[PDB]
Amino acid sequence: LVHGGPCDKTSHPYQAALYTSGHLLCGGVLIHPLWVLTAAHCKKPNLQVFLGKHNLGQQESSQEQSSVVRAVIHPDYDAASHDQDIMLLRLARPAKLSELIQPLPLERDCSAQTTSCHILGWGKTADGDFPDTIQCAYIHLVSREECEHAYPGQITQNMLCAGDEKYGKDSCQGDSGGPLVCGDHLRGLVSWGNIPCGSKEKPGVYTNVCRYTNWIQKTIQA
Ligand SMILES: N=C(N)c1ccc(NC(=O)[C@H]2CCCNC2=O)cc1
Numbered sequence: 087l088v089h090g091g092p093c094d095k096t097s098h099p100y101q102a103a104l105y106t107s108g109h110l111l112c113g114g115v116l117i118h119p120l121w122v123l124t125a126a127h128c129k130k131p132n133l134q135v136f137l138g139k140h141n142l143g144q145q146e147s148s149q150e151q152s153s154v155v156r157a158v159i160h161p162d163y164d165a166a167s168h169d170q171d172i173m174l175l176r177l178a179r180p181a182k183l184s185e186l187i188q189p190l191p192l193e194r195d196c197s198a199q200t201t202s203c204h205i206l207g208w209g210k211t212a213d214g215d216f217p218d219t220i221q222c223a224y225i226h227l228v229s230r231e232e233c234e235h236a237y238p239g240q241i242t243q244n245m246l247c248a249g250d251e252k253y254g255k256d257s258c259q260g261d262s263g264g265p266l267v268c269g270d271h272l273r274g275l276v277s278w279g280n281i282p283c284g285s286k287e288k289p290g291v292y293t294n295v296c297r298y299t300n301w302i303q304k305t306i307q308a
Contacts, residue, residue, distance in 0.1 A: 087205060088212045088283045089255040090223035095140055098206055098220060100190035100272075103139050104263060106130035110142065110216070113207045113264025115272055116189045119180040121306055124263035125275055125293065126163040126173040133157070135177060138186040142208055143218040148186040152179040158305050160298070169242050171277045171293045174305050193271040196296040201269030203227060203248060205290075207276070209261030210283065216260060223255040227268070228289040236288045246274045246294045249285030256285035266292045 102114030102122050112128035114135065122135055138148040156176035163170045181187055206222050225248045228236075233247035241247070248266060249256060257264065257276045266274030274292030279285070 087207050087209050087221035087223055087256070087261055088258050089250070089253040090205075090221040092219040093206060093222035096185065097222075098140075099138075099186050099188035100265065101139070101206060101220065103136040103142065103208060104128060105134040105136065106132065110208055110260060112260070112262045113209070113276060114175065115263075115265045115275070116181060116187070117192060117272065117302070118189055118306060119183065120177050122175040122177065123272070123275065123295075123302070124173050124175060125277055126159045126171045127165065127168070128263045129157060129159060129173060133175065135175065137181055138184065140220055141218045148184065150179075150182055150187060152177045152181075154178070160301065167240070167242075168245075168278045168291070170244050172275065172298055174302065190265065190267070190272050191270075192299065192302070193268065193273045193296050194299050196294070198268070198273075198296070203266060203268040203273065205248075205255075205257050205261070205264065205266055205276070207257060207261035207264040209258040209264075211258075223250065225250050225255055225285070225290075233289060237291070241291070244294050244297055245277065246292045247289040248274070248292060249289030251286060254284035254286040256280070256283045257290050258283035
């Protein structure tokens with residue numbers, strides 16, 4: 087995350103850190119004690135999910151670790167265009183809920199009214215380095231027309247755009263799969279964007295979670 091600041095310790099109980107080969111790969115969101123929501127391009131071998139983390143470099147009393155028993159990618163995911171970039175992860179051990187581990191409710195209404203949005207993650211910072219402490223930033227949703235002018239013919243209905251006009255606060259490398267939180271509800275997932283990271287003119291592109299409510303529900307209860 088570029089141009090942000092460390093989060094408050096108790097403000098991110100839904101955040102998951104995804105690891106492969108012993109190294110941080112992606113972000114994720116706890117949506118049920120048995121399920122984590124992330125991006126389909128985060129599909130790597132033998133995925134390790136860590137809940138209740140704040141500082142990656144330190145061992146914390148609040149943290150829980152689980153391996154993945156089932157990885158469910160959306161049937162219509164197209165890797166080249168990033169369309170329908172969503173994946174469900176079944177935990178081997180269901181999450182032991184606490185003050186620092188809780189699920190986040192999803193946004194069901196695609197025509198949901200204006201709320202305050204924020205992004206969070208352990209992705210690359212402004213200096214080009216990986217932080218130990220999780221980063222946070224407030225951003226605003228960018229109109230569909232404004233986004234189609236930034237990325238001609240690359241924006242589908244399964245994507246949302248968001249950014250910060252003043253500083254260019256944006257998600258970055260290592261944030262993929264993380265949440266776009268609008269009004270205490272999951273509104274989107276980190277999918278793709280401008281490299282080098284910065285949202286002043288080309289906003290970040292996120293998976294539009296409101297479109298996948300029925301698919302998410304059918305997968306969990308399958
Ligand atoms: N500028 C942006 N908004 C933005 C958002 C996400 C990325 N994603 C990555 O680089 C990927 C690579 C594959 C695994 N993990 C990642 O995070 C880039 C830019």
